[PDB]
RNA sequence: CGCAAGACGGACCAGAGCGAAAGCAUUUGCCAAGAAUGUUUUCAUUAAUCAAGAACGAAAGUCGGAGGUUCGAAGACGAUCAGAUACCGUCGUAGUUCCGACCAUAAACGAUGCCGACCGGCGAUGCGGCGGCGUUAUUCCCAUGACCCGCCGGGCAGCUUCCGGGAAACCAAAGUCUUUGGGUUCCGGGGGGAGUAUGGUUGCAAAGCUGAAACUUAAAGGAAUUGACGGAAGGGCACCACC
């Protein structure tokens, strides 16, 4: 008979103060009771959200993840927790008569915070293109995913998870990779088609809160 | 308004929302909604909860109305804003939504409810987990 | 028939006859 | 809130449809923005080139 | 046991070599009796796995 | 006799191809002997849009699609009436039906 | 939200590639192997096909050891039926997966032996190589990548043709065949009985290879034509159809 609901109690999570539009969405939990405590049942939880409404004027086909670490009263903190594409672009890259090139690495950022990184890559044809089909022989497809292998590892080795994202709400780093790979074949979208998170290093609330604060 | 203490604090132009995981498949249709999480849900109803006929289950006619009930608990509880979730049967089965995908979305329309980004989250796999049909396939 | 059927039936059929020699 | 009533002309007639010849179509316009017509779904005789009433503009209109 | 006589054990015994009563027994039977399959969750051929 | 030079597939230079599954009936064909579908509608029902646009929180928002390929085996793409039986002459042409543009 | 397990590698994926066939599709590394191309390199007839003999051989099946997620013979049950030992539904053993050892069968098909020569045309495609306006990548130029126009060789094919052939369907091979002979294996002789019996041999078994006769029958078959029909599609028509 009682009304669940009026046992729940609402807060908001927050973004990363890096993050412009600090507000992602308001959630509900259970009020604090017994060995149930908001803090615990609060961290551990998930928020997906477009990268649309993250940015002022980027595209909506990118979504972030955005596990929750602390609860500060109201407020309850969220940091990066992975980034995916709308499917419905994922099956709107994929084309015939052209070949998808597939690469992935597991790489350790400088603050113990290792990534799984998936990266996704599609054939342009030519303006004066007149063959139907625009494949790659094997070992082209190996170099350049070879390519894009090491300048996937080598930028995140050198820099850290605060700068790491910063240059991913971009994408900048996939049009370093058509670049430079264009001299050995003309690559058109390529994008991160997923980032995942594996370990997290320590719980370092410092570093969580100075991220979120000044 | 006010409710009172049911649903957050709120101003005037800004907006709460949730999420709507409209499972409608064939053989049923379901309209669960949620927090923006996923996990803490607020209102769930299928099409078989109105529907006393075991065949129309996943006909449009069920569809709506079960649609219509969460719609109104939406404004009871005071979400007002909708990610809608569509979802097939998936898996090695049909990737086609059923028929009661879109009548349960008008009705989220009719009954004056925000609508944000629209995805589908059927179950697609990596050619995995051998059909249920044997060789020869359902020859019905 | 079906001429597999009929292979299969007369193969079975040669299984008895195997069957009743090495009785006698 | 709803948009208030509105008067169409109708210019020539796309044919029946319906499957039974229930309805036509009559691509109408509002002989006030008389540039901007839209096709529209009707029922019964037609009369290609008199009035009718509209009460939303954009409803919708399929092609034969 | 079904080749002994009936004081050596719960099987011996009988004109034909058979059991004569379920070879499960009781987990909490008395030693002595406790013999054959004991606290047996299934019997049988254990197809499936 | 042969109905077909090709045999109902296209496979001229190997074995063996992978089976697949009818998503209809769940009957295993030859890969290159289906039928492919590639259905690129709209999961809004277009006739059924106007309101999803006015209700969206955002304007100017781009209505998203729905892009699955669909596989058959002929015993139930001839019954769905994707494939149609034709004649002698019309069933050796490889060109598809025209998209209907205008 | 995680977790664990075992399978399977979708969409890219194609009348595309590789392999003697069976067959082969996530990333990376290692191991040996192969065609084609290029060669004013080498040997100099070393070659073609091949009884006996040998290597490999889908799936199912067998034996031993792991694993058993999903499907699923057998089996159970619910339906359907007049009946329903089936189709459909829910379970579900063997099996499906891996390692090792057997079997050697498929519509194992291109229902088309291999090597060689000749006999039309056209647009493509994959690999290699040889050229050319130009675009492009970056660069400071050249190669080198991607694209365009050709070409040479080897492949998978396709379109067309009164080359010719064929019973025709059709085939640029199934042509160069009464104007009958390039070389060389296998193999058929009306339909059944019958791939049966028996003998031999292989196999753990299932079964494999070799393989008749008695007797019975006037046809059985192949390609195309017409009609009839269809619980096959498509246009048209009708207030004894609808609106
Ligand atoms: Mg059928
Ligand atoms: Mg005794
Ligand atoms: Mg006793
Ligand atoms: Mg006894
Ligand atoms: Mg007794
Ligand atoms: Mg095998
Ligand atoms: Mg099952
Ligand atoms: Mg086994
Ligand atoms: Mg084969
Ligand atoms: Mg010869
Ligand atoms: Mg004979
Ligand atoms: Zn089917």
Same mark, same amino acid.
């Given at each position: 008979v009682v009304d669940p609901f009026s046992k729940k109690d609402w807060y908001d999570v927050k973004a990363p103060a890096?993050?412009?539009?600090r507000n992602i969405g308001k959630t509900l939990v259970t009020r604090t009771q017994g060995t149930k405590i908001a803090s615990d049942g609060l961290k551990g939880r998930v928020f997906e959200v477009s990268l649309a409404d993250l940015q002022?004027?980027?595209?909506?086909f990118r979504k972030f993840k955005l596990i929750t670490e602390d609860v500060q009263g109201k407020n309850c903190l969220t940091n990066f927790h992975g980034m995916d594409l709308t499917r419905d672009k994922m099956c709107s890259m994929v084309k015939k008569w052209q070949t998808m090139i597939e690469a992935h690495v597991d790489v350790k950022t400088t603050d113990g915070y290792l990534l799984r990184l998936f990266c996704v890559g599609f054939t342009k044809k030519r303006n004066?293109?007149?063959?139907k089909t625009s494949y790659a022989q094997h070992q082209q497809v190996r170099q350049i995913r070879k390519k894009m292998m090491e300048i996937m590892t080598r930028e995140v080795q050198t820099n850290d998870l605060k700068e790491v994202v910063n240059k991913l709400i971009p994408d900048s780093i996939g049009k370093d990779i058509e670049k430079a790979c264009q001299s050995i074949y003309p690559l058109h979208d390529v994008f991160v088609r997923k980032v995942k998170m594996l370990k997290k290093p320590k719980f370092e609330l410092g570093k969580l809160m100075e991220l979120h604060g000044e | 308004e006010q409710v009172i203490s049911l649903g957050p604090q709120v101003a005037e132009g800004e907006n709460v929302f949730g999420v709507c995981?409209?499972?409608?498949?064939?053989?049923d249709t379901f309209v669960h909604v949620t927090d923006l999480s996923g996990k803490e849900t607020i209102c769930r109803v299928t099409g078989g909860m109105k529907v006393?006929? +075991?065949? +129309?289950?996943?006909?449009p006619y069920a569809a709506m109305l079960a649609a219509q009930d969460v719609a109104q608990r939406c404004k009871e509880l005071g979400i007002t804003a909708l990610h809608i979730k569509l979802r097939a049967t998936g898996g090695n089965r049909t990737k086609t939504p059923g028929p009661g995908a879109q009548s349960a979305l008008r009705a989220l329309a009719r009954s004056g409810m925000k609508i944000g980004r629209i995805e589908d989250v059927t179950p697609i796999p990596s050619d995995s987990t051998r059909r249920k049909g044997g060789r020869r396939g359902r020859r019905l | 028939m079906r001429a597999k059927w009929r292979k299969k039936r007369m193969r079975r059929l040669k299984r008895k006859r195997r069957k009743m020699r090495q009785r006698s | 809130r709803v948009q208030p009533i509105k008067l169409a002309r109708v210019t020539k007639v796309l044919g029946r449809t319906g499957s039974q010849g229930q309805c036509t179509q009559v691509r109408v316009?509002?002989?006030?923005?008389?540039?901007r017509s839209i096709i529209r779904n009707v029922k019964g005789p037609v009369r290609e080139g008199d009035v009718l009433t509209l009460?939303?503009?954009?409803?919708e209109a399929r092609r034969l | 046991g079904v080749a002994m006589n009936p004081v050596e054990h719960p099987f011996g015994g009988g004109?034909?070599?058979?059991?004569?009563?379920?070879?499960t027994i009781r987990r909490d039977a008395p030693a002595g009796r406790?013999?054959?399959?004991?606290?047996?969750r299934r019997t049988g051929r254990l197809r499936g796995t | 006799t042969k109905k077909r030079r090709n045999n109902g597939?296209?496979?001229?230079?190997?074995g063996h191809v992978q089976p697949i599954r009818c998503t209809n009936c769940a009957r295993c064909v030859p890969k290159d002997k289906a039928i492919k579908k590639f259905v690129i509608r709209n999961i809004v029902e277009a006739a059924a849009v106007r309101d999803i646009s006015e209700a969206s929180?955002?304007?100017?928002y781009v209505l998203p699609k729905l892009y699955v390929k669909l596989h058959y085996c002929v015993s139930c793409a001839i019954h769905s009436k994707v494939v149609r039986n034709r004649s002698r002459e019309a069933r050796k042409d490889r060109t598809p039906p025209p998209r209907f543009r205008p």
């Open positions: 890096m993050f412009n539009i002022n004027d980027e595209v909506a004066n293109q007149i063959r | 995981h409209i499972f409608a498949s064939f053989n006393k006929a +075991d065949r +129309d289950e996943s006909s | - | 316009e509002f002989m006030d923005d008389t540039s009460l939303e503009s954009e409803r | 004109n034909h070599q058979h059991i004569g009563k379920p070879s406790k013999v054959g399959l004991i606290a047996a | 597939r296209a496979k001229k230079g190997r929180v955002f304007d100017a």
